[PDB]
Design a protein around this ligand. Structure first.
Ligand code: HEM
Length: 179
């Protein structure tokens, strides 16, 4: 059921070439200066580590950002596992916070690509170990991206049957945003 909407500027990108470009600019969070690091934030001020939206911008002073929407959960200490389910995933640049400050949620001022009905899931079991819990699709794919590495996400997409080697122009599941 996954579909994709893309800005016309990316009609001649593929999922692979887009996410590589995006991830190379976003950069590896672990390599970032501590004082410019953005670990992301969840909407919904009653809960620091879960919510319907998770937004994260480059820790390397670049404008690249990503927004995930769904039933989003993060276990924080000590297993640091991102789990639940991502229905919609959006990439672009220039993350800005919504009216209301830090847990109001965010938007991208420049939206490049949106994945719809992504069904990107993962489970967390407090009785399992960290290395086991990190095997979930949702965790390893998003964690890869925050580490400037799109390969885990691309592998998930391919395993789903999504073609990542083809121009958005020429992907049956993709349609262009009206300019
Ligand atoms: C509100 C959002 C988040 C906050 C405030 C946060 C905070 C932290 C902090 C303070 C650490 C320990 C220091 C470090 O290793 O850099 C950490 C580690 C880590 N974070 Fe999170 N994080 C967030 C979201 C995420 C997400 C969404 C993921 C995965 C997709 C993630 C994955 C990890 C991993 C794998 C570690 C390392 C655990 C280890 O190997 O010791 N974090 N995070």
């Amino acid at each position: 059921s996954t579909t994709i909407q893309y800005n016309s500027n990316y009609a001649d990108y593929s999922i692979s070439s887009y996410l590589r470009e995006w991830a190379n600019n976003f950069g590896d969070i672990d390599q970032a200066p501590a004082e410019t690091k953005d670990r992301g934030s969840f909407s919904g001020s009653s809960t620091l580590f879960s919510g319907t939206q998770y937004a994260i911008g480059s820790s390397h002073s670049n404008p690249e950002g990503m927004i995930a929407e769904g039933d989003l959960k993060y276990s924080f200490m000590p297993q640091h596992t991102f789990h639940g389910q991502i229905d919609t995933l959006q990439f672009g640049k220039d993350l800005a916070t919504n009216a209301g400050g830090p847990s109001a949620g965010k938007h991208l001022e420049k939206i490049d690509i949106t994945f719809n009905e992504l069904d990107l899931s993962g489970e967390f079991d407090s009785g399992k170990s960290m290395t086991e819990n990190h095997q979930g699709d949702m965790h390893k794919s998003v964690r890869g991206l925050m580490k400037g590495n799109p390969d885990p996400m691309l592998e998930v997409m391919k395993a789903k049957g999504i073609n990542v080697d083809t121009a958005f122009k020429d992907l049956s599941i993709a349609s262009q945003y009206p300019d």
